[PDB]
């Protein structure tokens, strides 16, 4: 079976002296090596908290390795990261805690006034047996055991609750995110020593499994933990960045700082957009730059995966959300239950990316699913070349 910590293990294994995380910003510059030794470190802090296979942590902090590696060492540990929101307000992370009914709760600066909130109201998550701020967790870092764990878990153990629309935990485990990267890394052009700019919060479905793709490929991470279109560009060009995660709005907002103007990187190839189709003059605007997009449709459900528009394809089926990425079969679901591969209908997938489960949602769960594909709830359209369109 599959482990997505001793995946990062198995790299520092391979690549040992290879980059894996650089942030610029605050002066971090980690080989693959020294990450999986701060991932092991973080779960003998863990351990220590209590921690044990099946319980879960939630993780609500700003990007950084620590942030990374605390789920790393949880998936050695066979534990649950619930990764949150850090805007959200005090009363939606307290109903995050409750239901997923985490155990331990590490949480950022930013985030202790909401966590001091939540601490101080009438009845707060009792399951949590600790509140670890940052620089508590510096030290207990300092002191940890940096040895491998030895716990026999993986494949269908939960690793992830991912929470989305009150809100709902999705649950992935370590195969269906081993599956998810395996799909992003085996569809899009990504390749050993690219270097990948994260500019997105790491508790979104997308920018997790990034890194974690980022580290089965052997792919430096760098790390923007707060975007700055003022600083985007010189961090891109300065790192040698070759891909780049983003949304639409944020591309739109880059093509405007005068460092666009005359922007010149040639180690740029493309950037990867998450939903909501790309304007067809944006995409020109990028391509008169030698800058591809890559798009297409996920969702939480899905892992971050689902269909993917390469760039090739960007400006010819403007619209279309793309073809089903590798590993992944997308279809259409007739409102007479019927499912075909072409044509109109509810957009349903059969593919390892797909959650296990709603957290405690048994009727959810059920209704989620049909005879082996998961439905949806969007409709949308597949026309002979297998490119979707969705709609409402």
Known sequence: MKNIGWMLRQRATVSPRLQAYVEPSTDVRMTYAQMNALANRCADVLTALGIAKGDRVALLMPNSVEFCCLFYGAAKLGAVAVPINTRLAAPEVSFILSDSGSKVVIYGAPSAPVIDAIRAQADPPGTVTDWIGADSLAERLRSAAADEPAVECGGDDNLFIMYTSHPK???????????????WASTIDVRYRDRLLLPLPMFHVAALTTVIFSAMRGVTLISMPQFDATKVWSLIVEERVCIGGAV????????????FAELDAPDFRYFITGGAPMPEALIKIYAAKNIEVVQGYALTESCGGGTLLLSEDALRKAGSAGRATMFTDVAVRGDDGVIREHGEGEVVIKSDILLKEYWNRPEATR????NGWFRTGDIGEIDDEGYLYIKD
């Open 248 to 259: 639409p709005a944020i591309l739109n907002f880059m093509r405007q700082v005068p460092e």
């Open 367 to 370: 209704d989620a699913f049909d």
């Open 169 to 183: 935990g999705v649950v992935h485990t370590h195969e269906s995110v081993h599956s998810a990267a395996s799909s």
